[PDB]
């Protein structure tokens, strides 16, 4: 499943001018330092998260900084992500900035929560430090990127506690004695993020690295045909297929999900089952050692029932938002709350925080305003309460909300953009707008207003994942075979 | 005859900090055991000629147990990595330690060092906080407790704080000073402001990067400091009146402690090592430099403390990975 | 496991008076030391069995010859402190394969000469220590002068002890052409 596979974070590191200065104005020294940091972070990740941190690209600002580095990690993160969107063009899962300055906050770095595999959010900023300390900082930034957060509710309730009372755990505040392990709740959060469709870009094994090839690293690079890694674990799998990074006579692979007993597993076999409604099952191609890259349904499909629209392979609803902000016991409040609170209210139902007259939401659809949930507790799972928890009361309904903030200026207490406010009707900026406004792309279809000529699902890469036994590009020709 | 350090006892537990104090005309030793969360109190047995266990304070992850004697009353500042830091008072009537105060968890989060000092008949202690969120704070004794006085080095991971008194030389009198050591930063010298009753005039010590700890000693009225570097060169510097100038450098291989110790008017310096032997240095008065004296076999030394008992001198070596050791200067 | 001659720990072993290089040292150690050991000849492939060594230290030993390329099997060795010993001969290819060595020490070894191009291949070096030696500054030592004048790693000041006309001056101050011999 998703939890036994190995995930690969193709990471790109950007060293600013201050980080360049901190290493005697030498490119090679900065590159070696960053490689060591990434290697220790990978050592931390591989043991517990079953995830490899692979450094695939790097750039150093030897001349000067491309933007003004601020002492606020969040402003620096926003500016760095804008620069990455505008200027950085290398393909990577995450792009993290190695900054030589020191941030003036409690945190040694800032990263977007669950933002990996995204152009606008897939990255973070980290401040200079010792190689081990800065490796811990990079590890926690990447954990934020892969949906691992410090659950305030469970920590206060004592549901889970870090097993190390000396060095603490990675998500906590770091002292002289650096942490080495994640809590069990962190592992569970990572697994939940993976099972919700997140991190679909972490299932490809990198082919080109920044390091010279090693016989036993694990990655099949140029020239090498097979690589089972260190011979210690090669006995479990690939011992009879690959020896000394060389094929053993009649052999087809070294390792992989789509290749068993040194032989290409027949085409059509399942290598990755769909984890949720937005995911697309991956089938072996019959001539590849590794399973196909994790593709899911494009942004626009309907997940669950009608309450959600896929966005990055993850279902986006109001109930899921309530659970993500407050807790699993919390459920979305009834539509009665919305239509009788957002129409007329102050600090209890609204669609904005303008100080003049708040916002008088129009009765077209008030589902895009204040996020009203049921059974809200006293503290949220993440963020910070900007104010006080709302409490409003032939049926009696418990109805509550909040104004939780996050690393950005976005208010979590409002309904996320993209949530369905109606049939063929989805929220955008506190306004229930038609789906045409989002400008969603489509695959190639031959009929009128269909998807891949009717039969066929459009994937995230805008290619038709054809139905069973339809070879045609637009899923139009039925070709019987076996 | 010549002197040397002979091993006396092996205490079967690890330790980080070892402290000594005088309480009711008696000499005591406090050992902070990290992994059991205990402040172990030892007293000198006048019958068996050994150090007997006296009392215990139970914590969770104790890094420092600093004793403070304020007017014949013993207070212990216990710094903990987990569960917060507390202040205890020795109740001589019941012969037990009572917890009299709690330090806020939001202020002191990851303590690494505690230093106590007296300025004009006022008692202070400083906690070095190794976290960005927690700041190095000065607490002042107001007659019934310790309350926050000043925060010094914000957003820095301070690993050591050193109190010393040095003569700045537009003047002749000796004024209080504080030296702060932080990760990836140069040591910082603070000067006490008598008017505002605060430590001000932040100033760096140049050419010394990533110093773990600083410890001072005096030789014939001249103040020197020992600079602790984990891997590299540990250095000795001399106060020139307005700055510290290098005296000599020493090879450091896993060195977490560089402790000056004065025993019988003899100046010693012990440089610990996690990867090699621990080197004891003797001060050559004619050459005004430390010369190699002896090698100690202690597993990952964390501190070195000298105890004087009725004209017998003892050396307590705290071992982070093995048995803490007691030596005798013979 | 830990040899009886070595006082090992979770991640550090201190082998004192060992007459041979340990081979069955537990692979969880990342720091190995040798103080006043008995063996006087480090041969090739003496550290293959311990690939986890990140720090290697020698002190107060007595070495006749250190064999060619004696540090294979240590792809993560960042610190190598061969100091305070008495090494009669050091080999040219000794430090081969140490592409991650950032700190190397050869201090107080009473060395009088060093083979040509011994530091080549150590691109990651950031600090080389060579104090306490008695290097002869003559025609057999142009390579070190050129390397000191060309390298970027922090090397502390060292002094000549060779010809009477080259007494007590920095090798960093020596010139490539200036070698009377
Ligand atoms: Ca990828
Ligand atoms: Ca390879
Ligand atoms: Ca899939
Ligand atoms: Ca101190």
Residue numbers in the entry:
A (entry chain A): 233 to 625, 630 to 718
B (entry chain B): 222 to 551
C (entry chain D): 41 to 221
Verbatim from the authors:
We also determined the 3D structure of the LGI1LRR–LGI1EPTP–ADAM22ECD complex at a nominal resolution of 2.78 Å. Nonuniform refinement using the particle images with the original pixel size yielded a density map at a nominal resolution of 2.78 Å. This map corresponds to a part of the 3:3 complex, where two-thirds of the complex may adopt various conformations. In the cryo-EM structure of the LGI1LRR–LGI1*EPTP–ADAM22ECD complex, the LGI1EPTP–ADAM22ECD structure is essentially identical to that determined by X-ray crystallography. At the interface, Trp398, Tyr408, and Tyr409 of ADAM22 are stacked in a layer and project into the hydrophobic inner rim of the central channel of LGI1EPTP, which consists of Leu237, Phe256, Val284, Leu302, Tyr433, Met477, and Phe541 of LGI1. In addition, several hydrogen bonds are formed between LGI1 and ADAM22: Arg330 and Lys353 of LGI1 form hydrogen bonds with Asp405 and Glu359 of ADAM22, respectively, whereas Arg378 of LGI1 forms hydrogen bonds with Ser340 and Thr406 of ADAM22. The hydrogen bond between Asp431 of LGI1 and Lys362 of ADAM22 was also found in the cryo-EM structure. Specifically, Glu123 and Arg76 of LGI1LRR form hydrogen bonds with Arg474 and Glu516 of LGI1*EPTP, respectively. The hydrogen bond between Glu123 of LGI1LRR and Arg474 of LGI*EPTP is reinforced by stacking with Phe121 of LGI1LRR. The present higher-resolution structure demonstrates that Arg474 of LGI1*EPTP forms a hydrogen bond with Glu123 of LGI1LRR, which was ambiguous in the previous moderate-resolution crystal structure. No tight interaction was found between LGI1LRR and ADAM22ECD in the cryo-EM structure of the LGI1LRR–LGI1*EPTP–ADAM22ECD complex.
